Amino acid sequence: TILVVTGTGTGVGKTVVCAALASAARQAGIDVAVCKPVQTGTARGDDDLAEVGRLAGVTQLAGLARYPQPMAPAAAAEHAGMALPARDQIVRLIADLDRPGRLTLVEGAGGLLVELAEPGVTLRDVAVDVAAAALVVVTADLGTLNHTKLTLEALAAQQVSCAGLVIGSWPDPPGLVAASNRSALARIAMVRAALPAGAASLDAGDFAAMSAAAFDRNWVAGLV
Amino acid sequence: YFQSHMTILVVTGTGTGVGKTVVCAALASAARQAGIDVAVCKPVQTGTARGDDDLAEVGRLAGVTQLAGLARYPQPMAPAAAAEHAGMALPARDQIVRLIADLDRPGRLTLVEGAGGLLVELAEPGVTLRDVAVDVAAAALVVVTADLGTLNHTKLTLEALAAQQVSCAGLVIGSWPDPPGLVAASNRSALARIAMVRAALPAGAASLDAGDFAAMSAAAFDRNWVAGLVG
């Protein structure tokens, strides 16, 4: 029972979506682990797993490498002078997390075709190895339709199942494009949730309630 | 080396706002200065109610006269929603191909600029700039940023081209900073491992005058590459 969580790009609200799904799943009595093998941009304050523990109360938080530079992992590794983890290292970590009645989320860094492991292995390759489906995090902004469609093509090209879309940030008030994009994205795939703009600044209690309301309970329960 | 028909390039981007139009102008300007006749074609233009006019921008920047449009929609949205909002239809596949085809002249370079990124719907149903490039046997020039997120977006776009056997003409960084930061510099080196980087237009290029823009454009591309596009 593994879902990778990937974005159409960087800064679409992916980590916060992982947290919101984790919270929703915890509230349906499901055990959650979140694995983020590679993390970059630590020295500017980024630790995505810690963000997920804080916001969602997840305790099973697995990772393998953290790079200080705010770059793609490969770039960050080349700059640090320290290789990336190995493909087998990543896959085995995720397989060991996997438990009955457990939702295991694997968060990429951040986009689908970013190299995560040696040599040139992507989150798509990992999804394939572990037979995971992919939840795609999207924006509601202009440009999202091309990015969503590009990602969904890349998924289907290697036969990784789409498990749906989440809009990482839903503006208030929406606007004509956001409003339109929401309908358009619902014609391309199932939108599992649209997280209210600003959800990242919520305390643990408000975040949990936002999460329980954001997802369809039956869908979430269904994952396991 | 007499080619009896035009060379066609579709000019696409990894997203919206990555500098496609200014790249079109720049390549158009460079190719003109090599003595190639250039047409620029924009079959679908949205945002006209907000002043958006990519063809006019190109004429302004490059002095290009041969500017072919077709559909214009007032709202600054994806073609499908702008059309629906205006109570208009999207063009048919055939009207796009015809607009491009009627520009044919021997030794001409025709640049076909899309709306937004590659998989934006241009014609109903789900006809995209990638489908058009297949129909007219065009290569695709892909405009990218040097910002974080670019490698994933570039590889997604390139994969989609390959999926339909549309040849990649190379990459163009639409806006290149002075000076380049660590991120920008490593992205450009990573971009060069994925594909030929044809040019990286100076940030602010859009605001140059005809004189400066022409000089910029001539320095920006390899003249062997530009010269070689019409045979």
Ligand SMILES: C[C@H](N)C(=O)CCCCCC(=O)O
């Ligand atoms: C710095 C930040 N932690 C981050 O999202 C890195 C993502 C990698 C994107 C690399 C690219 O596609 O250019």
Ligand SMILES: C[C@H](N)C(=O)CCCCCC(=O)O
């Ligand atoms: C409005 C502006 N003239 C423009 O570039 C339209 C781009 C549309 C992008 C559609 C999408 O992929 O979401």
